[PDB]
Design a binder for these strands. Sequence first.
RNA 1: ACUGAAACUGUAGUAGAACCAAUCGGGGUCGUCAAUA
Length: 101
Amino acid sequence: MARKVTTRWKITGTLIAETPLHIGGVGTDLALAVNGAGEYYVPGTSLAGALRGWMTQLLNNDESQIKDLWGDHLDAKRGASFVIVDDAVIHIPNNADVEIR
RNA sequence: ACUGAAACUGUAGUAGAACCAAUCGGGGUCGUCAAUA
């Protein structure tokens, strides 16, 4: 068998930049994260850590509740995350481009 | 004198912390000008 899933939830919507955003990539702070197409994107690793980071502050660092959602490589009962966070291409609106602060 | 079979290199990890695009500056005011014959 696979991992036993009772219900799979597809959880979708539009995240809007309420301030500007910078997610950095390898290649001073003028390199923004780009996917393989060279489009600016949010890496799912960076979005997951934002979401996981918030829940960690919410749950007073109750590690068990966090690892029950986000997974754990160490605990023999846990392993893979039950949240999947996909990569998301950023749609910069028309007549706009990356700015430099 | 007879091919082993079957097995996801995966699992967890926010490219980030810090840094004022800033410092100085009255939109002001008076003596000529020209070189020959």
